[PDB]
Design an enzyme around this catalytic site. Structure first.
Site, short mmCIF file in Angstrom:
data_model
loop_
_atom_site.label_atom_id
_atom_site.label_comp_id
_atom_site.label_asym_id
_atom_site.label_seq_id
_atom_site.Cartn_x
_atom_site.Cartn_y
_atom_site.Cartn_z
N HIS A 167 -60.34 25.28 18.68
CA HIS A 167 -61.22 24.30 18.07
C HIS A 167 -60.94 22.90 18.61
O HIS A 167 -61.80 22.03 18.58
CB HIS A 167 -61.06 24.31 16.54
N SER A 187 -51.91 20.22 14.34
CA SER A 187 -52.63 21.45 14.61
C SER A 187 -52.62 21.72 16.11
O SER A 187 -53.05 20.88 16.90
CB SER A 187 -54.07 21.34 14.10
N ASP A 207 -57.87 31.52 17.24
CA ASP A 207 -58.10 30.09 17.45
C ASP A 207 -57.07 29.55 18.42
O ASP A 207 -56.50 28.48 18.21
CB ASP A 207 -57.99 29.33 16.14
#
Lengths: 181, 181, 181
Positions: free
Chosen positions: A47, A140, A77
């Site tokens: 992402h 992240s 992801d």
């Protein structure tokens, strides 16, 4: 007090933080990333790189490379990037023999720059790995490591945070290097 | 790195986690619970069992019993349940001689299943016991324990979480076993 | 279990918590504060004392003084107060030789009274010092300390909390004692 030493996990920070990098689009800040090997491969979240015209990666020591997308897996992801190794790349310490246990202390290292580090434990061993260490956009795609500095997981988004076990991340990376997505 | 050992509280998890159980209604997940003794008594929050047609309890080792409500105290939101002991029940380690101190490391163990464990310290010694360990529905009614594994409190709901000191919980349990509510 | 000792940071609490105080207006609770020296000087956040008709300070040992505002710096949201030293004031342990490192364990001590203590690490060394220890009104203006008890920072407001490095806080305090704001 002066003679004695403070309790700290700085050891793990020194060993692991050099290998965690920034990831940008070209100039926007996308997220974090981790250097996995001398070849110049880097794991980040899919992402983060989902809409990148050009991808740039920035180490803590001041170096700045352009990265090309090797591939990605939607399910985890995850996304592997590639950059030219100057000669002397800082890589994330990995121990394939280490067995993650519930209650293990872990530091979540992310680089939205400065570099942000949070502390927690393994709530549930990886399904993915759970930790009560704060996992946010800022970290992240970054690394999760133990007090030793050994990579436990790749921080991911979506009181409990999630990281992808380093064993699985290794395997997914390899399969993305060989085939592509 | 490989030779050395990671900092961990897994020891406490192994000693205490076996005794923390799930609690269901019959099939909905109500919350967590703690096995206190070989007799088969179990502490949980009153709000967990407030509206249970039938109560079921599920250990981590795979066993599944039906539980009957011994009684409850509204003031502490505590509730004691009873199940037939097979012979070999895992019980929560208790030390009546141990004195909880402010700053003590504590793990909050809950079982919304997998099993979730969080880490913190004692902010304020028990009024109830305070901790910055995350206390949520997932671990409400479960155990709070130190690095040794010794029961400190029963996690309860309503940045700071609350647990009922194990000394008080013991006393309330006894009085509920003898009289009822 | 009984023979062995729980992991704890209570040592730091005993050494540092005595020096952290309440701060009131006259009766409303404003926030927390820290005793810095025998002279009777106290650091707190400017926003805490921003609108105080009269300022009162309350130690953990039961003593209650009135404080007069020495001055404040808007930029750091710091404020120095002064009270008459009885003879025997508890002061916050300070080590000017200690170098704060990333990953250092830290306790955030605040006094909205009881006394609330939270645990974290140094995310980023001070710009200000970052920590994942909870920093809230309850502990805003209080002390941040390491496992030794040595002052690291002054907790301030506005997943990551902020404290003002103790080196800078010392300097600002001095300059406020001499000149005023």
């Amino acid at each position: 007090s002066t003679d004695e030493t403070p309790a700290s996990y700085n050891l793990a920070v020194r060993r692991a933080a050099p290998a965690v990098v920034n990831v940008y689009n070209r100039i926007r800040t996308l997220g974090s990333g981790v250097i996995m090997d001398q070849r110049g491969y880097i794991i980040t979240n899919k992402h983060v790189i989902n809409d990148a015209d050009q991808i740039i990666v920035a180490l803590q020591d001041g170096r700045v490379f352009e990265a090309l997308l090797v591939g990605s897996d939607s399910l985890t992801d995850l996304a592997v990037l590639k950059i030219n190794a100057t000669g002397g790349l800082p890589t994330i310490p990995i121990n394939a023999r280490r067995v993650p246990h519930i209650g293990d202390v872990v530091l979540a290292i992310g680089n939205p720059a400065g570099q942000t580090i949070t502390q927690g434990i393994i709530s549930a061993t990886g399904n993915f790995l759970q930790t009560d260490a704060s996992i946010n956009p800022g970290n992240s795609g970054g690394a999760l490591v133990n007090s030793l500095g050994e990579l436990m997981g790749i921080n991911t988004l979506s009181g409990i945070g999630f990281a992808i076990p380093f064993q699985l991340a290794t395997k997914i990376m390899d399969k993305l290097i060989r085939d592509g997505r």
